[PDB]
Write a protein that binds this ligand. Structure first.
Ligand code: HEM
Ligand code: HEM
Ligand SMILES: Cc1cc(N)nc2cc(-c3ccc4c(c3)CN(C)CCO4)ccc12
Ligand SMILES: Cc1cc(N)nc2cc(-c3ccc4c(c3)CN(C)CCO4)ccc12
Ligand SMILES: C[C@H](O)[C@H](O)[C@H]1CNc2nc(N)[nH]c(=O)c2N1
Ligand SMILES: C[C@H](O)[C@H](O)[C@H]1CNc2nc(N)[nH]c(=O)c2N1
Ligand SMILES: [Ca+2]
Ligand SMILES: [Ca+2]
Ligand SMILES: [Ca+2]
Ligand SMILES: [Cl-]
Ligand SMILES: [Cl-]
Ligand SMILES: [Gd]
Ligand SMILES: [Zn+2]
Lengths: 403, 403
């Protein structure tokens, strides 16, 4: 209860999550009912979060209780007393961004958490400068297909001044053009941002894979529209290693998953614009983006081309077609020399992360429903691993739309 | 919080679960941390549970607050007064067994909950009579392959007297023989029960699909060994519709899923011996029982016979082999005229069940991790359905091993 027992049912091994008892915010579940599956769940309170964060920082460098540790706490206290807020040291920004990734319960890629390039954009002053920072991020992270995890963090929230915001949910997204019938051409997940781009002066295309422009918001200004140079946006045309007609579907996806609408919280400070990027796990593209019925929805078309019996569920035509689409994604990215990880390799690495984190901190916050991949769930080790979900800070958080 | 909002992300539809608010007991989650992924979470007290169940019963038959209702309440009160417990009427038992199934959050098959044959074995006296009840159950439920859902209810627990227990976790289980090289021949899940059968006088076999005897326990006298007549245990040899070598693997599974180690709780009364059965969803056999690494673990055997590239994860050889194993299960059961349901059909029916239960009770307790199938998760509609998990009574509960 205070220290929950956690069992792995494949191996029989047992751990106790002692870290969850330190959970700093509250989630949606109660003893009466679990809401784990739901997608969406000053000075002295600021100082409490700040002090805890400084403690985490000095612990991570094995200098807990040092003079420098004590002096930084007093320095933070003095700044909050004088200004009501404080400024992170450069080293604290880097550490805090890595901690926020480490703490993200829904991320299966966290074995990489210590390897994150942190771009400090806290002196950004305009939307134009914001765009320059974002382009340098995309160029660095993409690296001609040898992807590198990165985050750029723009100025923190402060009283008497609006937030920096990136209106787009990701730095690279395909347009979704809503038709008169209610159908969509392109990505149905992006209908709202597409219409906002048009409203703010973008001349729309009419393709299924039109890369959207960015809507960048500087403090107290309407969003400004910026087009990404096409040479900056690396894409992979999709082909299949043995189904030669697959290439004639004309499908593609982009190299760089870069989420831009989440809020980064470090030490009680809030960074509403802090886009971050890694590389794709193949099921995100091959299973969710392409096969979700409410996304590109290609499953029946692929099955029909494969000459599967789409008239009865028990032929497992959906399963067979989904598998080949995921094969196509892995083959195409590997052929293009663009970083990609399959769901077996990624979940294997996450098991090693759990072991590392059990030794380092006595547990790991993890959201089973998001860690288990959307195909072949029980064929991966994480399916059989019990998990404890809780909120630690530093953190990436959902935040309301700026419109 | 009181009435959780529940969203379907494929359709966009919204419901509010007003049934969760009536959750009688308490689960393992708290605002600090979610434990939803974990497998295992006074006459005045009995009267209170008995009272609420009788009300459920008379409400269910549209006889609320009537004379028969008022009379039954006072009869239980008087029976508790003279005995310390009370007896269900056979019709209340039928109602309660159906509600316990309806209330089971981890069961995807609950569209069928109103169709359940209840065998009243509460007059049972001995392990010999227990074996006859169980054999009648298996014969009725198997029905030469046209499976029918059923439950047999043995006498309730009572003070100063041992329980009836079925030591086996299922009525049909394959033996698990520990080999000298450390490995297991047969089903590794059943190593403990296999050794207990041998302990209690069973002459073991040496095959990979040897059906175990039953260890049956009458009150206070010890467990007795019983052999199931081979003609009563319907099995399905597994072949593949196009991979002719699949049959040569010698795989088989049994027709009847009949769980025998859970406790049934109705109106404060507890039945530690109440085996219940339905029919299989194909992923249970093809994915979990045959492909779990700690079960039969045949995935690589099949992939070698399919000439798949097993030295790289990104060939998705595990996924392709799993798909064909699941095809083999569906094809073999359909060819044998044994009832089976695929995971697409089953999850579609559960969505209809959720819709039914929203109108009837304002919600439905559902455990997302158990409802979503172990392959092709997001290809099924339940993956995109938010769910609320909570404990309602009457209920099936886990209980300690009788040894
Ligand atoms: C390096 C390779 C990475 C891989 C393979 C990876 C993989 C994933 C996957 C599969 C998800 C589930 C999202 C979905 O369902 O599509 C996810 C979520 C998430 N990832 Fe990672 N990730 C990586 C890097 C990163 C980085 C660099 C960060 C931040 C610095 C990060 C933070 C997050 C967060 C916050 C979520 C949850 C998003 C939400 O709740 O909406 N990830 N990741
Ligand atoms: C009629 C066809 C049925 C189907 C297709 C079905 C399907 C399933 C499935 C797939 C599970 C998940 C467990 C697993 O991974 O194997 C489950 C669990 C469960 N089922 Fe159903 N079931 C059926 C009938 C029944 C009946 C008749 C009852 C009781 C009267 C029942 C009660 C339960 C319970 C209590 C669980 C929870 C198991 C646990 O927590 O260990 N089911 N069922
Ligand atoms: C940094 C990073 C790397 C990576 N490889 N993937 C990521 C995926 C998300 C993500 C967050 C939410 C979300 C989805 C994906 C997709 N689902 C299908 C629908 C909408 O919900 C966030 C960050 C990622
Ligand atoms: C009535 C019925 C019908 C049906 N078709 N399946 C059922 C499955 C269970 C079940 C019970 C426990 C359990 C598991 C499944 C799953 N795995 C194998 C881990 C072990 O835990 C119980 C009753 C079922
Ligand atoms: C209803 C359900 O919680 C929702 O569809 C979740 C399930 N698990 C997921 N898991 C991942 N990785 N990504 C998702 O978007 C979702 N969606
Ligand atoms: C840890 C995890 O909750 C556990 O292994 C669950 C996951 N989902 C499951 N789902 C079903 N249907 N059956 C199971 O045994 C499990 N096991
Ligand atoms: Ca300063
Ligand atoms: Ca009778
Ligand atoms: Ca080979
Ligand atoms: Cl994506
Ligand atoms: Cl089973
Ligand atoms: Gd070909
Ligand atoms: Zn929970």
């Amino acid at each position: 209860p205070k220290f929950p027992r956690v069992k792995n049912w494949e191996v029989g091994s047992i751990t106790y999550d002692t870290l969850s008892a330190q959970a700093q915010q509250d989630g949606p579940c109660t003893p009466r009912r679990c809401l784990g599956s739901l997608v969406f769940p000053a000075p002295e309170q600021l100082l409490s979060q700040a002090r805890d964060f400084i403690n985490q920082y000095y612990s991570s460098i094995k200098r807990s209780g040092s003079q420098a540790h004590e002096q930084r706490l007093q320095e933070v206290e003095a700044e909050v007393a004088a200004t009501g807020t404080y400024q992170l040291r450069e080293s604290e920004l880097v550490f805090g961004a890595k901690q926020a990734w480490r703490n993200a319960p829904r991320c299966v890629g966290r074995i990489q958490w210590g390897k994150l390039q942190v771009f400090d954009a806290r002196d950004c002053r305009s939307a134009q400068e914001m765009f320059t920072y974002i382009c340098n991020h995309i160029k660095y992270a993409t690296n001609r297909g040898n992807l590198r995890s990165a985050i750029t963090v723009f100025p923190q929230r402060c009283p008497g001044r609006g937030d920096f915001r990136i209106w787009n949910s990701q730095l690279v997204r395909y347009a979704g053009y809503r038709q008169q019938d209610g159908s969509v051409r392109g990505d149905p997940a992006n209908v709202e941002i597409t219409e906002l781009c048009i409203q703010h002066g973008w001349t729309p295309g009419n393709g299924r894979f039109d890369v959207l422009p960015l809507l960048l918001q500087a403090p107290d200004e309407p969003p400004e529209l910026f087009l990404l140079p096409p040479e900056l946006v690396l894409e992979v045309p999709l082909e299949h290693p043995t189904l030669e007609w697959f290439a004639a579907l004309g499908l593609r996806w982009y190299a760089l998953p870069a989420v831009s609408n989440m809020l980064l919280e470090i030490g009680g400070l809030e960074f509403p614009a802090a886009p971050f990027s890694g590389w794709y796990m193949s099921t995100e593209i091959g299973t969710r983006n392409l096969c979700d019925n409410h996304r590109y929805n290609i499953l029946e078309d692929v099955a029909v081309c494969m000459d599967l019996d789409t008239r009865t569920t028990s032929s497992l035509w959906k399963d067979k077609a989904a598998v080949e689409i995921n094969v196509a994604v892995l083959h195409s990215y590997q052929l293009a020399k663009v970083t990609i990880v399959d769901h077996h390799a990624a979940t294997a690495s996450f098991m090693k992360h759990l072991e590392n984190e059990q030794k380092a901190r006595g547990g790991c916050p993890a959201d089973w429903a998001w860690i288990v991949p959307p195909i072949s769930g029980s064929l991966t080790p994480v399916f059989h691993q019990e998990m404890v979900n809780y909120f630690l800070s530093p953190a990436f958080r959902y935040q309301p739309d700026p419109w």
